[PDB]
Design an enzyme around this catalytic site. Sequence first.
Site, mmCIF file in Angstrom:
data_model
loop_
_atom_site.group_PDB
_atom_site.id
_atom_site.type_symbol
_atom_site.label_atom_id
_atom_site.label_comp_id
_atom_site.label_asym_id
_atom_site.label_seq_id
_atom_site.Cartn_x
_atom_site.Cartn_y
_atom_site.Cartn_z
ATOM 1 N N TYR B 61 0.827 -1.226 0.000
ATOM 2 C CA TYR B 61 0.000 0.000 0.000
ATOM 3 C C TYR B 61 0.853 1.264 0.000
ATOM 4 O O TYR B 61 1.748 1.358 0.832
ATOM 5 C CB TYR B 61 -0.964 -0.088 1.178
ATOM 6 N N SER B 134 3.678 -7.167 1.509
ATOM 7 C CA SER B 134 2.675 -6.554 2.408
ATOM 8 C C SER B 134 1.290 -6.725 1.768
ATOM 9 O O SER B 134 0.930 -7.888 1.501
ATOM 10 C CB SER B 134 3.046 -5.143 2.747
ATOM 11 N N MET B 135 0.508 -5.673 1.498
ATOM 12 C CA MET B 135 -0.798 -5.867 0.819
ATOM 13 C C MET B 135 -0.593 -6.582 -0.525
ATOM 14 O O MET B 135 -1.476 -7.286 -0.938
ATOM 15 C CB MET B 135 -1.536 -4.554 0.552
ATOM 16 N N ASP B 180 8.295 -7.196 12.597
ATOM 17 C CA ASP B 180 7.379 -6.395 11.761
ATOM 18 C C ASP B 180 6.304 -5.725 12.640
ATOM 19 O O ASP B 180 5.583 -6.447 13.337
ATOM 20 C CB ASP B 180 6.774 -7.306 10.702
ATOM 21 N N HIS B 212 9.643 -4.537 8.784
ATOM 22 C CA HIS B 212 8.661 -4.760 7.703
ATOM 23 C C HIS B 212 9.347 -4.753 6.334
ATOM 24 O O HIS B 212 8.744 -5.354 5.390
ATOM 25 C CB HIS B 212 7.547 -3.711 7.797
#
Lengths: 270, 270
Positions: B61, B134-135, B180, B212
């Site tokens: 994102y 991630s996303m 994370d 992350h």
Amino acid sequence: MNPFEKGPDPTKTMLEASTGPFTYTTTTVSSTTASGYRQGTIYHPTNVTGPFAAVAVVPGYLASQSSINWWGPRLASHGFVVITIDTNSTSDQPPSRATQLMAALNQLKTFSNTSSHPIYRKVDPNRLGVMGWSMGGGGTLIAARDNPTLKAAIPFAPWNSSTNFSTVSVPTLIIACESDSTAPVNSHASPFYNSLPSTTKKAYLEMNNGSHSCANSGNSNAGLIGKYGVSWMKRFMDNDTRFSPYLCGAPHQADLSLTAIDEYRENCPY
Amino acid sequence: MNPFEKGPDPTKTMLEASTGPFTYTTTTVSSTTASGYRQGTIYHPTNVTGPFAAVAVVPGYLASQSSINWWGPRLASHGFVVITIDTNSTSDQPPSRATQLMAALNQLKTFSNTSSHPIYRKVDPNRLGVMGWSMGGGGTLIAARDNPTLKAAIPFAPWNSSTNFSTVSVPTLIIACESDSTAPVNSHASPFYNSLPSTTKKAYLEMNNGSHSCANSGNSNAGLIGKYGVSWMKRFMDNDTRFSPYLCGAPHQADLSLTAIDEYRENCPY
């Protein structure tokens, strides 16, 4: 109130889940730091105040932590400190595996007493348990025999030359793999269980069609096997009778119709 | 005897190098040309004839290609065609990122059929994989759920609002970052891995104290992480059993002693 009680009241779904109610993290122990064993990994609860009961887990002949370390997150996420160890040699036999389990537990106590250590104040030194696979399961039973202040023992697919554990007074859950050709249940797991005195709290969980690796990392019955290992450590290390129904009561009895379990023995109640 | 096998026999040295044994080049996909995603860059091998398996990589994102594009050179220099994409909007959610991964793979197929295009004839349309951060790692798992013909999936530091991927049948390596605080492993990567079926070839690589960005461009352990990503895509997209030891054998067991890795899970042998 039981002062050792941690986490929400159990349910079948909660106990069969891949992870318990707690967040956890994992700290490595280098070979330089490790004392009395080769190296290890510590799994410890986070975002919950301890101290916690602690468990050491040892593999079998020619095996490493990868065979056994699913127990680390599964128990840590239910409020235990777990160390998974590699042995000085992968060729170590059961008596040596027993000595290394105790060395690992002894070092957890040292780390818990060390301000700089991630697990500072996380270990209750008086609430300790042992687990292991195959010759590490033999080592688990030898550790229990030689250290009767241990609160719980869970040998899984255990192997040992001698079947005489008639002096073991530690609450012992033997996890046995029906189809095991490496540690056949009729020469190892079953006679070990049968030797235990009537006064020792005990259980025998035999997994239908289980190979020698039936309780190892990545097994296909982790929900059920994890439910019993967590319930055992809750009942015997935390004195947590909220878990008694899952070992001895109506939830337990409903498991005995699952194809996954070919046999169960116990001396309930506990 | 394996027509999909490319390049020399693997070694630890060759797998940890910033590039593999092949030379590669880049082709930019303008936002005028790109079909079903914003724009992208294609990384493709130049000193070896294909066709090659193809991979699409999507960011998280608000993020752009720069966060994820180190995978381009690393995989192209091991005989893969890689497209690193920007999403139509940087605010696209995981289901949209899944659709855009597949649209990018579809356009790689079109370009491979386009006589005038730099990657003419370089893509094997039957051998495709997905990766994402991630996303975008959420998107990768959704793409794998909805497109079971995919050969491989590598979500890294994945984030998703739901943890249930119990119908994914695509060989999946989840790369997780232990510390994370954006997509905590206890709420994202670990539950995703734990949801996968037993019949699905899978691995979980968790980087010790990883932030992350632990598998993003410019990360601190790109030799080791890229070793796992290359070995996964070789084993599953090329059916290249020469890479088995690096995932399941003695070289893999040696990696488990490194401080950089805090946890590894798998259902070896594959």
